[PDB]
Design a protein around this ligand. Structure first.
Ligand SMILES: CO[C@@H]1O[C@H](CO)[C@@H](O[C@@H]2O[C@H](CO)[C@@H](O[C@@H]3O[C@H](CO)[C@@H](O[C@@H]4O[C@H](CO)[C@@H](O)[C@H](O)[C@H]4NC(C)=O)[C@H](O[C@H](C)C(=O)O)[C@H]3NC(C)=O)[C@H](O)[C@H]2NC(C)=O)[C@H](O[C@H](C)C(=O)O)[C@H]1NC(C)=O
Length: 327
């Protein structure tokens, strides 16, 4: 095991904790892109659920200078998530004719940003007119907040719809379920990384779901971090696990709506945990489910299942699915 990945997460967080204070240890998550540059002095934070871009620095020397730098690079960054290291300070951000953010944010001119010229003017504007300052209690932080367009979610999702269509046809899993999961888990952030090393758009863990999927396809080993950070691959894997959950691990459930509630919960909690909500023996755990209505099942799962994380998850995913379901 290269748990030596845990180690440099530990090293990463401690390097930040040293420089920013334990009060300011902001680190990438499933719905939050956070990239440190300039030796942990400058950080760029995209918050994908709230539609905000926050670019901070704590450097006491020419803060505007390299706020400007992060601002231009972040706006123009070409999404290759598999080549970006959010647990590192090395600048592995690349400028692209087609920035990942293109269309999700407009300058104060109202124009989408794709050229270094326009990006530059916009940085200069923000620096002159929206420069903010804060202090942790012990040292001064300079920042710029950039609001993303109101329909930024839809813009982002548009990138992956084709993949979702394909995966859905392939594995017989509803588009709306894939989209509802993906939205809930990452808000369609391809750089998404969790505290349990779930990876990518559909937040797939390598040694559990990833391993199962490979095995179920005559394939050997476990998907790498590069693989699960490639949109197409990740969505195909996640969707495959959705199908594996639905046919194999939870096929005992007869009612498709009840199976779905079970499948959704299990995607986050494991089918094991889900079955052991009805009882320790998979057999009549399944038929206790076969006695209840789906409203029951959704009830019993949203209230009486161990992981609080899961109980909210099922509520969340079903709530999103209802909006992606109608066409
Ligand atoms: C962003 O939030 C994170 O979301 C992730 C999902 O989007 C979620 O990851 C999921 O976590 C659960 C466990 O927490 C995990 O479920 C396990 O899955 C494996 C693989 O199918 C099961 O192991 C198999 O068990 C069967 C029999 O049941 C065996 O026959 C088979 O051989 C086993 N295969 C392997 C490779 O071991 C496992 O079943 C256990 C062993 C059991 O029956 O008791 C499941 N666990 C449980 C408890 O049932 C799920 O697959 C995993 N990944 C995905 C893509 O869904 C994150 O959860 C993390 C890991 C967490 O625990 O916090 C979510 N949270 C975070 C913080 O990242």
């Amino acid at each position: 095991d290269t748990n030596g990945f845990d180690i440099l997460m530990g090293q990463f967080a401690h390097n930040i904790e040293n420089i920013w204070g334990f009060k300011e240890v902001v680190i990438a998550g499933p719905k939050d892109y956070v990239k440190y540059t300039d030796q942990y002095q400058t950080r760029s934070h995209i918050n994908f659920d709230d539609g905000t871009i926050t670019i901070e620095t704590i450097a006491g020397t020419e803060p505007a200078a390299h706020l400007r730098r992060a601002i231009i690079k972040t706006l123009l960054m070409g999404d290759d998530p598999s080549s970006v290291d959010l647990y590192s300070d090395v600048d592995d951000i690349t400028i692209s004719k087609e920035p990942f953010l293109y269309g999700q944010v407009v300058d104060n001119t109202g124009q989408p940003i794709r050229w270094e010229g326009r990006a530059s003017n916009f940085a200069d504007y923000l620096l002159k007119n929206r420069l903010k300052s804060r202090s942790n209690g012990l040292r001064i932080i300079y920042s710029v907040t950039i609001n993303m367009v109101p329909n930024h979610l839809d813009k982002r999702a548009h990138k992956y719809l084709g993949m979702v269509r394909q995966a859905s046809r392939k594995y017989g899993v509803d588009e709306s379920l894939i989209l509802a999961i993906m939205q809930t888990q990452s808000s369609f952030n391809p750089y998404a990384v969790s505290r349990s090393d779930a990876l990518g758009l559909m937040q797939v863990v390598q040694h559990t779901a990833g391993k199962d999927v490979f095995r179920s396809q005559g394939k050997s080993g476990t998907p790498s971090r590069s693989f699960l950070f490639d949109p197409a691959s990740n969505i195909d894997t996640g969707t495959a696990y959705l199908a594996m959950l639905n046919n194999v691990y939870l096929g005992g459930i007869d009612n498709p709506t009840s199976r779905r509630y079970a499948v959704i919960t299990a995607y986050n909690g494991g089918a094991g945990s889900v079955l052991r909500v009805f009882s320790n023996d998979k057999i009549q755990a399944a038929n206790i489910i076969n006695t209840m209505t789906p409203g029951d099942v959704y009830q019993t799962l949203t209230t009486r299942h161990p992981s609080a994380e899961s109980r909210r998850y099922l509520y969340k995913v079903n709530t999103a699915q209802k909006s992606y379901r109608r066409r």
